[PDB]
Amino acid sequence: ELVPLEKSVTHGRGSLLIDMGLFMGRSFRVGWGPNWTLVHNGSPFKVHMEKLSLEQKSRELQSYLMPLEIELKNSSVDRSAQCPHFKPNAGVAAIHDYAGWVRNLSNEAGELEAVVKQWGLTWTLCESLWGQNEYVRNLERRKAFSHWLAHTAEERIEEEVSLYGPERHVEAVFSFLTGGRISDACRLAQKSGDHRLSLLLSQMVGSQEMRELISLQLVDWNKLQVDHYIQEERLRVFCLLSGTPVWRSSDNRSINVCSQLDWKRTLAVHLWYMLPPTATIAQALRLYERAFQEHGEPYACYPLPPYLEDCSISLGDEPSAKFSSLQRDVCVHLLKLYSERQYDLCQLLDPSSVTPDPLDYRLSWHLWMVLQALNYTHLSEHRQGTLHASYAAQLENVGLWEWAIFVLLHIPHPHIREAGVRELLNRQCVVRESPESLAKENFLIHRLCVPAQWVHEAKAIRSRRDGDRHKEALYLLKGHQWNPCHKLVTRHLAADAVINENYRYLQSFLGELSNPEHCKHIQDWETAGKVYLDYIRVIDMLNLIQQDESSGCELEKLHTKVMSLCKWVELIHCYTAKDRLAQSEMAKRVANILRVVLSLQQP
Amino acid sequence: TMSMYPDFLKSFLEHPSSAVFELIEQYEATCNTQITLLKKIVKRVTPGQQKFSKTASILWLLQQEMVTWRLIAALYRDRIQSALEEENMFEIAAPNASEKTIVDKLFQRDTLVRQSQLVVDWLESIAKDEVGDFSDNIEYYAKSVYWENTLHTLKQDPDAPIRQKLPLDDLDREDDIRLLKYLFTLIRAGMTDEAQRLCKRCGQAWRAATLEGWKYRCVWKTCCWRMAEDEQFNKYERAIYATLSGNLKQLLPVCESWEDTVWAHFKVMVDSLVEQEIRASIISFNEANELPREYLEANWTLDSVFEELQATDKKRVLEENREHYHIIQKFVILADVDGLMDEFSEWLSNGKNLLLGHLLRFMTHLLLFFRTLGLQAKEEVSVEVLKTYIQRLIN
Amino acid sequence: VSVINTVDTSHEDMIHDAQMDYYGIRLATCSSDRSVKIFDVKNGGQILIADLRGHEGPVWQVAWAHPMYGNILASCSYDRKVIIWKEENGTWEKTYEYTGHDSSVNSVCWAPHDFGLLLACGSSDGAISILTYTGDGPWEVKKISNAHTIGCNAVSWAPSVYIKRFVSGGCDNLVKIWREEDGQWKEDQKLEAHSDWVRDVAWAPSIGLPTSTIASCSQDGRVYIWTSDDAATNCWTPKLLHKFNDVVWHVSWSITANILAVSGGDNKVTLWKESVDGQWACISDVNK
Amino acid sequence: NVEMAYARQMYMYNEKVVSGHLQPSLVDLCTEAAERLDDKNVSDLWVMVKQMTDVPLIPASDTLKSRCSGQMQMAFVRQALNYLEQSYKNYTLISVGTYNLVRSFLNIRLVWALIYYCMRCGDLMAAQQVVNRAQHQLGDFKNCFQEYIHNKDRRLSPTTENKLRLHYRRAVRADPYKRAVYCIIGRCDVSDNHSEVADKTEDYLWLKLSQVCFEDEANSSPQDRLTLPQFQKQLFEDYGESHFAVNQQPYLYFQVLFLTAQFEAAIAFLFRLERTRCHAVHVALALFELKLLLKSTGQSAQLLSQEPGEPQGVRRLNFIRLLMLYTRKFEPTDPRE
């Protein structure tokens, strides 16, 4: 075993500069390889090697499948250049497509992870704003957002109420009010008797002024030094309907109504109770923001990611110096972008915001696609490329194919994109054709428009490094290679076929390379190619013509050709032993044929 | 600058008062002045160098028009201008007539070969050269003598290292690399006495020696071929020797343009026909062809020279081949030019040559010279080309 | 994270470096026992296929070449000899032995297949030799003398984007980028930030990115990230990753997602990935 | 995109300017969007803009004359040299406190070294510290440095500067730091770039600025004096951009011109820079709103037109044609812009 810990003498001589390198040989760093494979060092004691991949909840194939399929169904192909350019369709109700997918998931998502609910929340908020009479439109958006807020808190509110046991107007009523469901809240308030609310459901009208008069009465009571010996937080709840989020009373008590509420509910309360029934979302957002930014107490709660909430950083005497490094949930930034065009898209699109690990990028990528489709492209080319690459890498880590190809193809740079996809193909392509491989190839060719010639070129690279001649040559056939193919066949296949009497194959290959342009470009084409072609053709024609009444013109042609063939057999160059044998065989055969031809002509 | 129509029109017009000779003269002069004015203002920045490269490539169209002009002019003048008329006096010879006179007979005799020789002459006339006093070619390799660094090390001809392997020194090795680069440049350009002036003012024993002969001789050439075949000599020098021998190395011939490798293959055809010519004119001795096969006595014909020069090492069609102005001058030299005129006129009609702002007017002026000097190209092609050019230039 | 087959190298000393092939079917390994061993790890089975002993001193680095040129394996060494092995019909033989160096050759890195079959050799004599196989004939050698004042520790080529460029780091505290201009290798840039000897420099295989990234580990421990947004501008900006207390040895980028693997003298490998905002964050700590 | 960030900046600035509230900060707003937007070119260039242009104004109804009154050059050199020293020391903290970073940096490249480190970190205090440290054998250099630190613009006595000139001509002509200090302080070796320590282009230019004598001292010898016309002329015409490496000049030569006060020249070059169209527009608009751009009369005329009778070389650029072309870019979607 390597010595446990000798780090003194050898360290002093390790700082020596005569051969610091030789003294620093003990070192090692072998990093990566294809598909994130990690090589490393460390009963024999030597070196070990283990894989490396994204193992966090590594079993979700179906989801990948569904949204990826939806994306392809919504994308357009532009084959203007050699490398196609896929572009998303501009705002084709993609947000609706995503919500449907989330609902389909919800059928069997009762027993899934927490990331599912995070994503659901994110997408539905995106829908309630940017989903897409100005006043009427704003009011409808407000109603939808209210529905979302109520729905997302519904479960929590129901759990809380069950815990209350005998209800208390101090807490029970607070929870009901912030979570809506006023129709059931009235049933809960029957202990004292309250049906003016039924009278309200009948005519939803003048609520503003009613509540304002209630507030006036309350503030009169407050200034009159009364309304003090009543229940402590009953007064807290009265201040809520009044419209004061923080009340400093005569006893110097800081009555914070906004306390015990998570950031979302705090903003919601500001929208309905504190602000008038006719208001714009932006103003409310800004007010809430200033609320936790102090004035004067910070009565609102900081927008925290759903996973970082547990341990709100201990703001011991210095809260601000930490807030300037803490992230905020995607929803806030979505609202800000919905209002104005001055914000860092990069912060908004950070994997950590939704899921702690920095390796999951599905949501981020789909959100970037939606943002591109909403005419919001402030993102720099560098970051776009980085995102695409990381997503493709995650895909490859699991083991995906054409979808990573499509992600690569959204990069708006022709050469770079093409090279990337080519490299990807070469590394993953398998020479052994399988049902799955064939399916993938068909997909690529019939959906993403790629060539089978490129597929065969990939196969030929593999079958050249360590592969066999047969497969290499087959793949080169359809790969439109002239010089290399020519060389290959002349050296090995040719003589083998001569001695195995298989010329039909040799001839197909050689004639496909004899076409006007091909023959022009192929080097040494004239020499060897012509030689072999002539041999085969001469045999065949001799046989046929002898049987077919020996046509004289064809006989003359054969004579000319055989003379030319003699002229070339002598010039055959020898580099190997097979060349000699083949040469001799050909010479013998041609001499016999020549004799037969002379016999059938002159005599 | 946009008025490149006016100069061509004024030349064809004053030549419509004048001869064909001054016509082609003014055409080449105009193309030259045009490219030169183009390169007048081409300013580069580290990035701006890329745009200036695009501009020099664009003006390289005017460059190729200038080259096609000079080539077509000299070739047509040799074809049609009376300079082909003389007695068989240069082709008179006897048994005691020297190889000089046998070569004179070949030179007055062979039309195709002499045309190929003029072709090589054009290859050399269009010369790209590294400067003497401004390039490390010899401006830095102007030492008192060659291998002065090696000599100093030893203290502390090409026969020398060929015999003794390891000794050589790297400073002089690099100096010789740059020198031989200069020499391949200058001689493949054909500035032979200037290359000799270099070999002398530097004093490179092997350079002067290997290249001092004024003109058996077959033995000498076979010997040169064998020495080029030998190892251990520099890249450009190896190519220089193989070429002056009648064989091809690759080291510097790795850097042969379509026209440079054309010079190579045409010189190969001409040298092979020259050797077969002397062999027929048996004047040369038997022991002179000491290594018969190691020299290629047989010649390639013009069409095969062109096919080989066009076929790219990637088993492809050459880019300089697919270029048109080069292809145009090529058909003009190869004398398969009326076919190409028909190809371009039908190209306009099938959807080719349309986009190019020059190629139309180029075809116009070229057919103008061709026909007006001699009635070869037909008036049908003439009218189609002239009318398309007329509509374009009217616009 | 998951543990696959653990190989038994049957070695006698510390394996200084390793490197897998293009398709991940083989693993070369080099030790201080003057022996480069080839391992065929396929479907979880450790099989020693070849043992190549041709060096007089310790072997420092091993580099596999692109598949199209065959199974070419380079191995540098202390004995000033760069030995290029080649596999023909299952048999490994020495095809070329470049002995033109005055001190230990420390690093070998092949060029991208687009450029050709070029190999760069960095030696402790402060010289980089570029070997070039033209297909026919021998190897053309272009030696860049006095590249580094003290010595050269590591070389790495740039991804093909064709301008042939490669980055080299030396014991003179300077990271230098080289560029082939007019057929001659000329010094392009001098990046200065380290206060001590540069141990290893590796150019990121940038995928789909306009920016070019290079990582450099050093003796003092500071790992710097050099980035140039535009190749033309050649303005390189460094960014400190983390100052490790112990000497960092080598750095390696992942082919697909650009994740830097850093190894220090503390016998641990720390993986670093850049976030969208820009800050580099460690994702895992794989100790020996 | 980045156009859109600059856009939101513009819309906010315009709404504030219209509603008449307290002045919005174009310069800091650009630098701040750059703080957020992870474009190191944006961050460095906008911080450089604010940090070289954050000098005292002087409207005085004279734009070019106020920008060319020698005190404008003095304040320019102040902000520029201090920012350069600060960036050098903020890089030095990598080789690393201040003196520790400076020494470890003398080793990153590998008492005059410590005093030169104080010069390049902007610390006359550390300079005087190392001064009183090595005042044993150097003598009157401590006193000349003390007078330099007592005169706020680092302006030596004329007799002292003549003494420094003759001194560097006598002895330091063959210690490079001593030669550099004596020459830049006594306005000596003005022709000599002192390439022994001059390894940076901007540092060399700041040494020439420290060599620049701005006054009409008819008793100042002919060649050991640097005038602004000579310096800027050799810098713009004679130095050229193809020498200053137009590659890195997207951050470098524009910077040299904007710090040597070739305002419309830097604006022209960075307007020719594609990725710097909106940037050049923003910088030039900031300056012209400060009334700092000397404008040209004819709009159709070339981007830079020189008036007849104008101080030879002072560049007048058509802001009309410039911003008109810059708005013809995004006119097709953002007529709001």
UniProtKB/Swiss-Prot annotation, chain D:
It is found in: Nucleus membrane; Nucleus, Nuclear pore complex. Plays a role in the nuclear pore complex (NPC) assembly and/or maintenance. Belongs to the nucleoporin interacting component (NIC) family. This is Nuclear pore complex protein Nup93. It comes from Xenopus laevis (African clawed frog). The gene is nup93. The chain holds residues 180 to 547 of 820 of the full protein.
